[PDB]
Amino acid sequence: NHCLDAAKACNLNDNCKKLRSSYISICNREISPTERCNRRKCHKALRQFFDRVPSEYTYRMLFCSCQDQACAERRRQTILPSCSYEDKEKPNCLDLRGVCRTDHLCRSRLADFHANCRASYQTVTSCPADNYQACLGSYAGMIGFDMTPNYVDSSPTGIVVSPWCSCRGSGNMEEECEKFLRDFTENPCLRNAIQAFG
Amino acid sequence: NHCLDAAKACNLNDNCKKLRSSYISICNREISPTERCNRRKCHKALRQFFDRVPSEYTYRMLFCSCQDQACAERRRQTILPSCSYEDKEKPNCLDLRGVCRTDHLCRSRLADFHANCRASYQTVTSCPADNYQACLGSYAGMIGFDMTPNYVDSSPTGIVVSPWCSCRGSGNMEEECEKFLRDFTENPCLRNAIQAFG
Amino acid sequence: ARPCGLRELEVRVSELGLGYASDETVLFRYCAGACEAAARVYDLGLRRLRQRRRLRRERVRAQPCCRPTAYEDEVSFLDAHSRYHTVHELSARECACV
Amino acid sequence: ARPCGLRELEVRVSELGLGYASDETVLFRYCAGACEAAARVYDLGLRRLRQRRRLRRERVRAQPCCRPTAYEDEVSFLDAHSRYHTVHELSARECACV
Structure with missing residues (x-):
C-alpha cells in the first residue's frame, strides 16, 4: 500500500x-x-x-x-x-484553542491552517487559490502542538480528521465551538487536498 | 648472565x-x-x-x-x-663538582655518596659500618644529575666507575681534584659493595 | 578483492527472523571484505609462537577480522498488529579489520 | 571452555621472528578463548540473510572474533650488538569479542 511505500522511502x-x-x-x-x-x-x-x-x-x-x-x-x-x-x-x-493560543508558534500555525484550508464556495477545489499544498502544509504544521489533529479512525477512504476535543460543556458558546471544530472535521478544502495528494 | 637475568625480572x-x-x-x-x-x-x-x-x-x-x-x-x-x-x-x-653543588639535590646526593661510600681504613669491607647497601643506594642516587657516574668500559671484573670528568686543567688544584675523583675511581668501599652485590 | 568495508542491502524486517511481523523495509548495513594490510607485530609474534607450539590449546586469532566497530543507533517500524518497535544496533555504522 | 580474555607467556624476543637479535625476555600478552555471549541482533540478521542467499558472494563474518581492543604502549630491550630497541604494540593490553 502507499503508506507502507512511504515508510520505506523514509527509512x-x-x-x-x-x-x-x-x-x-x-x-x-x-x-x-x-x-x-x-x-x-x-x-x-x-x-x-x-x-x-x-x-x-x-x-x-x-x-x-x-x-x-x-x-x-x-x-x-x-x-x-x-x-x-x-x-x-x-x-x-475552545478551551484547547485557548491553550494552543498561549504558545506563539501554535497560535501562528493554527492561524495558517484557518487561512490556508478555508473552504471556498467559489473555487474548483474549495481551497483558496486552488492551493492544495499550502493547506496540507498548514495541517502538518499543527502536529506536536496543543492542537494536534489526527485521523479519527481507520476508515480507508472515508477520511475524518479532528483535534482531540469536543464541543460538550460549551455553555452559551456552543455554536462558536462547533464552527471552530468544523474547520477540521467538515472542511471540503481539506478533504479535497488530502484526497488529491494520493 | 646475571645482567640478562636482571633485565628479565624487570621486564x-x-x-x-x-x-x-x-x-x-x-x-x-x-x-x-x-x-x-x-x-x-x-x-x-x-x-x-x-x-x-x-x-x-x-x-x-x-x-x-x-x-x-x-x-x-x-x-x-x-x-x-x-x-x-x-x-x-x-x-x-672540580668545575663539575661546582656545577653539581649549585643544584640543591645534586649537592645533597653527592654528600650522601661521600658519607656512605668514602672508604674507611678500619672495617673489613672498607665501608663505614660495613654498610654496603647505603653506599650502593647513594651511588644510584647520583644517576640523572650533573654528577652521573658510570662504568667506564666493559671490563667484566676490573670494574672502574667514574663521573664524566677529568683532572686535567686543574692548575694548582690538581691534588684536590684527584682526591675528589678517587672517591669514585679508586674506592675500595665502592669496589667491594658492587662486587658483593652479585 | 574488495577491502573490508560497509555494504548495504534493502531488507524486509520480517525477513530477518527476529520475531517482528512487519512488512516494513530497512536499509541493512554490514561489514564485509578482505583484510590485506601488512600484519601487526603482535600477530606476527603470535603466529610464530603458535607455530612453535608455545601456546595453550585454545582458539587463538593471529589475523584481523573485518567487523563493525560502531553500530546503528536505532531504527523503527510499525508491525502487522499496529504496534511500533525500535531496534538498537541492528546495522553496522563503521567497519575495520580488528 | 575458557572465555575470550588476556593470556600471558614469557618469551625470548629472538623467538618472535621479528629480526631482533636479543636474548632478552618479555612478558607477551595476547587474546584467546571463546566468544559465548548471546548473539547480537546484527549477527542474527546477517546469518539469516546469508542463509536466504541474499548476500553477494563475499566473505562476511556473522560471529564475533576474540581480538585485542587495545595494545601495549611500549617495551624495550638491548640486543647482542649493544643497541637498544623499543617496540610499540607488541602485546595486547585489552581483549573483547568484536
Whole structure:
C-alpha cells in the first residue's frame, strides 16, 4: 500500500529514518501503568520530524492513499496517537484553542491552517487559490502542538480528521465551538487536498 | 648472565618494564645529527626509574656480576651512557663538582655518596659500618644529575666507575681534584659493595 | 578483492527472523571484505609462537577480522498488529579489520 | 571452555621472528578463548540473510572474533650488538569479542 511505500522511502533516507525512529521511540515509551508516554517530549520529537525532514517524505506518510484497513490504520498511526493525540481527558475545543493560543508558534500555525484550508464556495477545489499544498502544509504544521489533529479512525477512504476535543460543556458558546471544530472535521478544502495528494 | 637475568625480572614486572622502557625510549631518541638525545629529559626519566622502581629490580640491573664482555657491556649500557653520561666536552672534575653543588639535590646526593661510600681504613669491607647497601643506594642516587657516574668500559671484573670528568686543567688544584675523583675511581668501599652485590 | 568495508542491502524486517511481523523495509548495513594490510607485530609474534607450539590449546586469532566497530543507533517500524518497535544496533555504522 | 580474555607467556624476543637479535625476555600478552555471549541482533540478521542467499558472494563474518581492543604502549630491550630497541604494540593490553 502507499503508506507502507512511504515508510520505506523514509527509512531508506538516513535523515528521515533517524528523525522518524526518534519520535517513535520517545512516543512509544511507557512511563508507568497510568502514564502512556512523556507527551511533551513526544510532541517535541514530532515537531522536529515535520520541521527537519522534507515534505516529500513527510506528506507522503501523513496523506498516503489507502484502499483497506491495514493501510488506513498505518496512516492513523503515523503520529503514534495513543501518546500524542488521545488523552483520558477530552477537553472542550475552545478551551484547547485557548491553550494552543498561549504558545506563539501554535497560535501562528493554527492561524495558517484557518487561512490556508478555508473552504471556498467559489473555487474548483474549495481551497483558496486552488492551493492544495499550502493547506496540507498548514495541517502538518499543527502536529506536536496543543492542537494536534489526527485521523479519527481507520476508515480507508472515508477520511475524518479532528483535534482531540469536543464541543460538550460549551455553555452559551456552543455554536462558536462547533464552527471552530468544523474547520477540521467538515472542511471540503481539506478533504479535497488530502484526497488529491494520493 | 646475571645482567640478562636482571633485565628479565624487570621486564616481567609491569611497573619496572614501563619505567625502564620509558627511559630507554627517551634516552635513545636522536634529536639531530649533532644532538644525540634530549639529555635533560633522559636524566629525568632515569631519576624516575631509580626513585619509583624498587631497588630489588634496580640494583640488580646496575650492579649485576659479570664474567664476560657481553655481560659487562650490558651492565655499562644500563643508563644508556651515550646519552646520559658521555659528552662532547669532558669537564674538570672540580668545575663539575661546582656545577653539581649549585643544584640543591645534586649537592645533597653527592654528600650522601661521600658519607656512605668514602672508604674507611678500619672495617673489613672498607665501608663505614660495613654498610654496603647505603653506599650502593647513594651511588644510584647520583644517576640523572650533573654528577652521573658510570662504568667506564666493559671490563667484566676490573670494574672502574667514574663521573664524566677529568683532572686535567686543574692548575694548582690538581691534588684536590684527584682526591675528589678517587672517591669514585679508586674506592675500595665502592669496589667491594658492587662486587658483593652479585 | 574488495577491502573490508560497509555494504548495504534493502531488507524486509520480517525477513530477518527476529520475531517482528512487519512488512516494513530497512536499509541493512554490514561489514564485509578482505583484510590485506601488512600484519601487526603482535600477530606476527603470535603466529610464530603458535607455530612453535608455545601456546595453550585454545582458539587463538593471529589475523584481523573485518567487523563493525560502531553500530546503528536505532531504527523503527510499525508491525502487522499496529504496534511500533525500535531496534538498537541492528546495522553496522563503521567497519575495520580488528 | 575458557572465555575470550588476556593470556600471558614469557618469551625470548629472538623467538618472535621479528629480526631482533636479543636474548632478552618479555612478558607477551595476547587474546584467546571463546566468544559465548548471546548473539547480537546484527549477527542474527546477517546469518539469516546469508542463509536466504541474499548476500553477494563475499566473505562476511556473522560471529564475533576474540581480538585485542587495545595494545601495549611500549617495551624495550638491548640486543647482542649493544643497541637498544623499543617496540610499540607488541602485546595486547585489552581483549573483547568484536
